[PDB]
Design a protein around this motif. Structure first.
Motif, PDB file in Angstrom:
ATOM      1  N   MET A  67      44.394  48.165  44.904  1.00  0.00           N
ATOM      2  CA  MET A  67      44.541  47.703  43.535  1.00  0.00           C
ATOM      3  C   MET A  67      43.555  48.495  42.697  1.00  0.00           C
ATOM      4  O   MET A  67      42.649  49.129  43.237  1.00  0.00           O
ATOM      5  CB  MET A  67      44.209  46.205  43.424  1.00  0.00           C
ATOM      6  N   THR A  68      43.746  48.470  41.383  1.00  0.00           N
ATOM      7  CA  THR A  68      42.833  49.139  40.474  1.00  0.00           C
ATOM      8  C   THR A  68      42.452  48.116  39.432  1.00  0.00           C
ATOM      9  O   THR A  68      43.264  47.270  39.045  1.00  0.00           O
ATOM     10  CB  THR A  68      43.471  50.354  39.772  1.00  0.00           C
ATOM     11  N   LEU A  88      50.552  37.699  36.286  1.00  0.00           N
ATOM     12  CA  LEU A  88      51.531  38.749  36.531  1.00  0.00           C
ATOM     13  C   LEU A  88      52.902  38.310  36.039  1.00  0.00           C
ATOM     14  O   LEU A  88      53.561  39.015  35.269  1.00  0.00           O
ATOM     15  CB  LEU A  88      51.618  39.041  38.030  1.00  0.00           C
ATOM     16  N   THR A 144      54.573  39.812  32.678  1.00  0.00           N
ATOM     17  CA  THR A 144      55.604  40.796  32.964  1.00  0.00           C
ATOM     18  C   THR A 144      56.974  40.183  33.254  1.00  0.00           C
ATOM     19  O   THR A 144      57.159  38.965  33.182  1.00  0.00           O
ATOM     20  CB  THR A 144      55.195  41.684  34.164  1.00  0.00           C
ATOM     21  N   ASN A 176      55.461  48.606  38.755  1.00  0.00           N
ATOM     22  CA  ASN A 176      54.852  49.538  37.817  1.00  0.00           C
ATOM     23  C   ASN A 176      54.492  48.820  36.527  1.00  0.00           C
ATOM     24  O   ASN A 176      55.094  49.048  35.483  1.00  0.00           O
ATOM     25  CB  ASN A 176      55.790  50.712  37.520  1.00  0.00           C
ATOM     26  N   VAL A 177      53.507  47.933  36.617  1.00  0.00           N
ATOM     27  CA  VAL A 177      53.045  47.179  35.460  1.00  0.00           C
ATOM     28  C   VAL A 177      51.540  47.027  35.535  1.00  0.00           C
ATOM     29  O   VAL A 177      50.930  47.242  36.580  1.00  0.00           O
ATOM     30  CB  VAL A 177      53.653  45.756  35.405  1.00  0.00           C
ATOM     31  N   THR A 178      50.943  46.659  34.414  1.00  0.00           N
ATOM     32  CA  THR A 178      49.512  46.449  34.355  1.00  0.00           C
ATOM     33  C   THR A 178      49.351  45.116  33.656  1.00  0.00           C
ATOM     34  O   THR A 178      49.971  44.861  32.627  1.00  0.00           O
ATOM     35  CB  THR A 178      48.817  47.568  33.577  1.00  0.00           C
ATOM     36  N   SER A 199      46.116  46.570  38.166  1.00  0.00           N
ATOM     37  CA  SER A 199      47.366  47.147  38.632  1.00  0.00           C
ATOM     38  C   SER A 199      47.376  47.265  40.155  1.00  0.00           C
ATOM     39  O   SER A 199      46.335  47.183  40.817  1.00  0.00           O
ATOM     40  CB  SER A 199      47.571  48.540  38.027  1.00  0.00           C
ATOM     41  N   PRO A 257      48.923  50.058  42.471  1.00  0.00           N
ATOM     42  CA  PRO A 257      49.576  51.366  42.568  1.00  0.00           C
ATOM     43  C   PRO A 257      50.859  51.389  43.384  1.00  0.00           C
ATOM     44  O   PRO A 257      51.839  52.017  42.985  1.00  0.00           O
ATOM     45  CB  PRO A 257      48.479  52.254  43.155  1.00  0.00           C
ATOM     46  N   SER A 302      39.337  50.246  33.088  1.00  0.00           N
ATOM     47  CA  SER A 302      39.775  51.480  32.441  1.00  0.00           C
ATOM     48  C   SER A 302      38.536  52.361  32.296  1.00  0.00           C
ATOM     49  O   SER A 302      37.565  51.969  31.651  1.00  0.00           O
ATOM     50  CB  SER A 302      40.352  51.177  31.058  1.00  0.00           C
ATOM     51  N   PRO A 327      40.901  53.441  35.733  1.00  0.00           N
ATOM     52  CA  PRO A 327      41.244  52.662  36.925  1.00  0.00           C
ATOM     53  C   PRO A 327      40.202  52.767  38.030  1.00  0.00           C
ATOM     54  O   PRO A 327      39.882  53.861  38.478  1.00  0.00           O
ATOM     55  CB  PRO A 327      42.576  53.267  37.365  1.00  0.00           C
ATOM     56  N   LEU A 341      42.031  44.761  32.963  1.00  0.00           N
ATOM     57  CA  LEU A 341      43.364  45.229  33.293  1.00  0.00           C
ATOM     58  C   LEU A 341      43.431  45.443  34.796  1.00  0.00           C
ATOM     59  O   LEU A 341      42.497  45.975  35.403  1.00  0.00           O
ATOM     60  CB  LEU A 341      43.675  46.522  32.533  1.00  0.00           C
TER      61      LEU A 341
END
Ligand SMILES: CCCOc1ccc(-c2csc(-c3ccccc3Cl)c2CC(=O)NC(=N)N)cc1
Length: 368
Positions: free
Chosen positions: A20-21, A142, A146, A94-96, A88, A90, A24, A26, A86
């Protein structure tokens, strides 16, 4: 979902993690996938077992929540500062998403030496979130932020100096049919806190333990990727080992073995066939209907091997040894958990892990 296949890794007995990331730019981190907890907590300060950690100062999108969290438990504890940032995955959707993050500043017996993960992703519900249920769990954020459907799948595949490497897939927002074989059977999520379910009966090598239904869920039964062993309430545990000792009987073993603490070895010579299969019947979606999940010794004996069935004082815990060999769907949208034979899963040429149904069972509403 192709992008999500094999997005999981771990070392046997040290849990599965997904990359995960956070922040900012990432910040890459390995996070334990835990269906047995509900916090997204990441080391955020140096620690002897951490080779990397979350650095809030380096994140331009970090937002402090000015609020702490303290989590003590029997072996030690972790302590952090609430924040938002934030996040995500990887090798996931494909969302943040902006999610709550418990930045672990101090801890003891939380992190594991060599496990290679720097935090935990509690996928359980808000009710058990720390410090309270107002701290929205990651998966909730999430789904709220999203279009990803309220559901995720877990295919834990299992597996020399080094603990064995394990792999698996966490499919978020769906079901990947290539990941399982046969039919998907669902057991209801009794209550939305832990992924609680109800076991209506269990047999060792076809033989019923004949215990009152409530003993199988004495306290509760949960599906937990964050736990290695199949943990059983004392009474059930004792009854299970007796039956297994009998099945094995032709070899005797140190009971330090039966207590999970000690190991056993042969050198592809392992006499699997000497050990019985274990069937857990889970309440079906229809009252008197249930289905069974059958595991092989290959699953409850983890590699030399250690008996991976241990006693619990907190109810039944269907950990990795149970989940490995099955494709587990955490259908949050429909409050159910589905099980299907896994595309992966260790099995010899005489037996195979199985998911079968239905089986009818009288009462069972009262197994809870
Ligand atoms: C296969 C190895 C799993 O490794 C673990 C590392 C940490 C924790 C843990 C320490 S405090 C704590 C914790 C306790 C209460 C609330 C929140 C957290 Cl993060 C957890 C999560 C946990 O207990 N998960 C679980 N039972 N499935 C559990 C397993």
């Amino acid at each position: 979902f192709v992008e999500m296949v094999d997005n999981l890794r771990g070392k046997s007995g040290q849990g599965y993690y997904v990359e995960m990331t956070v922040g900012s730019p990432p910040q890459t981190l390995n996070i334990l996938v835990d269906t047995g907890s509900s916090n997204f907590a990441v080391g955020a300060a140096p620690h002897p077992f951490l080779h990397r950690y979350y650095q809030r100062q380096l994140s331009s999108t970090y937002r402090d929540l000015r609020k702490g969290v303290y989590v003590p438990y029997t072996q030690g504890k972790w302590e952090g500062e609430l924040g938002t940032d934030l996040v995500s995955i990887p090798h996931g959707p494909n969302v943040t998403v902006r999610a709550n993050i418990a930045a672990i500043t101090e801890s003891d017996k939380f992190f594991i030496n060599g496990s290679n993960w720097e935090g935990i992703l509690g996928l359980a519900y808000a009710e058990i979130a720390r410090p309270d249920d107002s701290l929205e769990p990651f998966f909730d954020s999430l789904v709220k932020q999203t279009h990803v459907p309220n559901l995720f799948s877990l295919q834990l595949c299992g597996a020399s100096e080094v603990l064995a490497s394990v792999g698996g897939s966490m499919i978020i927002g769906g079901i990947d049919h290539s990941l399982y074989t046969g039919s998907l059977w669902y057991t209801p999520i009794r209550r939305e806190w832990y992924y609680e379910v109800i076991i209506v009966r269990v047999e060792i090598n076809g033989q019923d333990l004949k215990m009152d239904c409530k003993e199988y869920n004495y306290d509760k039964s949960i599906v937990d990727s964050g736990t290695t062993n199949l943990r059983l309430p004392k009474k059930v545990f004792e009854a299970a080992v007796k039956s297994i000792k009998a099945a094995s009987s032709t070899e005797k073993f140190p009971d330090g073995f039966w207590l999970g603490e000690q190991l056993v070895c042969w050198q592809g010579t392992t006499p699997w066939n000497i050990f019985p299969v274990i069937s857990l019947y889970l309440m079906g979606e229809v009252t008197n209907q249930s289905f069974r999940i059958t595991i092989l010794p290959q699953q409850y004996l983890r590699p030399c091997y250690k008996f991976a069935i241990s006693q619990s004082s907190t109810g039944t815990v269907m950990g990795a040894v149970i989940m490995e060999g099955f494709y587990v769907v955490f259908d949050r949208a429909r409050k159910r958990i589905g099980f299907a034979v896994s595309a992966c899963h260790v099995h010899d040429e005489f037996r195979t892990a199985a998911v079968e149904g239905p089986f009818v069972t009288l009462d069972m509403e009262d197994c809870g």
